[PDB]
Scaffold this active site. Structure first.
Site, PDB file in Angstrom:
ATOM      1  N   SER A 155      86.463  25.400 -12.447  1.00 16.23           N
ATOM      2  CA  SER A 155      86.515  24.654 -13.706  1.00 16.23           C
ATOM      3  C   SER A 155      85.873  23.279 -13.684  1.00 16.23           C
ATOM      4  O   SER A 155      85.756  22.654 -14.744  1.00 16.23           O
ATOM      5  CB  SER A 155      87.942  24.543 -14.241  1.00 16.23           C
ATOM      6  N   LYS A 212      88.152  16.016 -13.379  1.00 22.07           N
ATOM      7  CA  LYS A 212      88.246  17.401 -13.831  1.00 22.07           C
ATOM      8  C   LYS A 212      88.503  18.287 -12.620  1.00 22.07           C
ATOM      9  O   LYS A 212      87.717  18.296 -11.654  1.00 22.07           O
ATOM     10  CB  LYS A 212      86.958  17.850 -14.521  1.00 22.07           C
ATOM     11  N   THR A 213      89.590  19.050 -12.685  1.00 21.99           N
ATOM     12  CA  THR A 213      89.968  19.971 -11.613  1.00 21.99           C
ATOM     13  C   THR A 213      89.264  21.327 -11.712  1.00 21.99           C
ATOM     14  O   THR A 213      88.691  21.693 -12.749  1.00 21.99           O
ATOM     15  CB  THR A 213      91.468  20.223 -11.658  1.00 21.99           C
ATOM     16  N   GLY A 214      89.312  22.076 -10.618  1.00 20.33           N
ATOM     17  CA  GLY A 214      88.915  23.468 -10.649  1.00 20.33           C
ATOM     18  C   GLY A 214      89.780  24.221  -9.666  1.00 20.33           C
ATOM     19  O   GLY A 214      90.115  23.697  -8.597  1.00 20.33           O
TER      20      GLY A 214
END
Length: 268
Positions: free
Chosen positions: A49, A213-215
């Site tokens: 993500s 922003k994470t993934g």
């Protein structure tokens, strides 16, 4: 900071990697000096993500020459929903505005929102094209949500390197890849992320503001990218990618926080 502190940080990152059954890809770039702390910076990792930052930047760039784009409402049906769509699931039918979809995909990692925005731009290739336009020759978006999270070893689809993503994050959030208003909006969305409290945010000093922003994906893939804004220093770009050797692995928030913690201590 100094070369010796950065060297020590890099050793500590190698030690950190040795504690888990996987690999760590890391870049921290101190925009005060251009100094870099790196670990496996040129290996490819599945971005999961974290690509939503590049996606939202592309949408913002388009909006610069079409202000009303951000207010356009995109309809969609239940059958268009994919896994992990906590915001878009609430608005099936008439749908949501482009700005609302960007906020949802960045702050809640909403997957259907990402798919709608990818479609709006012209497909995955349009996101890759945007990356190329800002000087990123490495990033490639090949699939949509949620297939892009398969994180298969040796699969180069939907990957980038920590070095390339750090350079892009620097250009987008700190530099001049976007116009002033658009850069401000991208930062604002990422500052208000709700999914990253245990990752970069947990590793850096509390006094630092973090836009991230994470993934998260298969093979225990656990990522976080963004910029930390100290109150008394220039911004520091953080890119943390991890992935694991087992399909039964889970992402490790603590490893991601630890990597950021190690680098933060060096950039003094």
């Amino acid at each position: 900071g100094s070369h010796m502190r950065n060297v020590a940080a890099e050793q500590q990152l190698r030690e950190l990697e040795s504690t888990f059954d996987g690999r760590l890809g890391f870049v921290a770039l101190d925009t005060a000096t251009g100094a870099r702390i790196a670990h496996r910076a040129d290996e490819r990792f599945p971005f999961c993500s974290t690509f939503k930052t590049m996606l939202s930047a592309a949408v913002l760039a388009r909006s610069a020459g079409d202000a009303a784009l951000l207010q356009r409402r995109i309809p969609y049906a239940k059958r268009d929903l994919v896994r992990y769509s906590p915001i878009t699931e609430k608005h099936v039918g008439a749908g949501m505005t482009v700005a609302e979809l960007c906020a949802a995909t960045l702050q809640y990692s909403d997957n259907t929102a990402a798919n709608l925005l990818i479609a709006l731009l012209g497909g995955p290739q349009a996101v890759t094209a945007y990356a190329r336009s800002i000087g990123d020759a490495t990033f490639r978006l090949d699939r949509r949500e949620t297939e892009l999270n398969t994180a298969i070893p040796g699969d180069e689809r939907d990957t980038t390197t920590p070095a390339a993503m750090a350079a892009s994050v620097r250009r987008l959030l700190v530099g001049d890849a976007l116009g002033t208003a658009q850069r401000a909006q991208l930062n604002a969305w990422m500052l208000g992320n709700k999914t990253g409290d245990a990752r970069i945010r947990a590793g850096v000093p509390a006094g630092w503001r973090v836009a991230d922003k994470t993934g998260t994906g298969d093979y225990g893939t656990g990522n976080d990218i963004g910029v930390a804004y100290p109150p008394d220093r220039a911004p520091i770009v953080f890119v943390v990618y991890t992935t694991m050797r087992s399909r039964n692995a889970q992402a490790r928030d603590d490893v991601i926080a630890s990597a950021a913690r190690i680098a933060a201590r060096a950039f003094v």
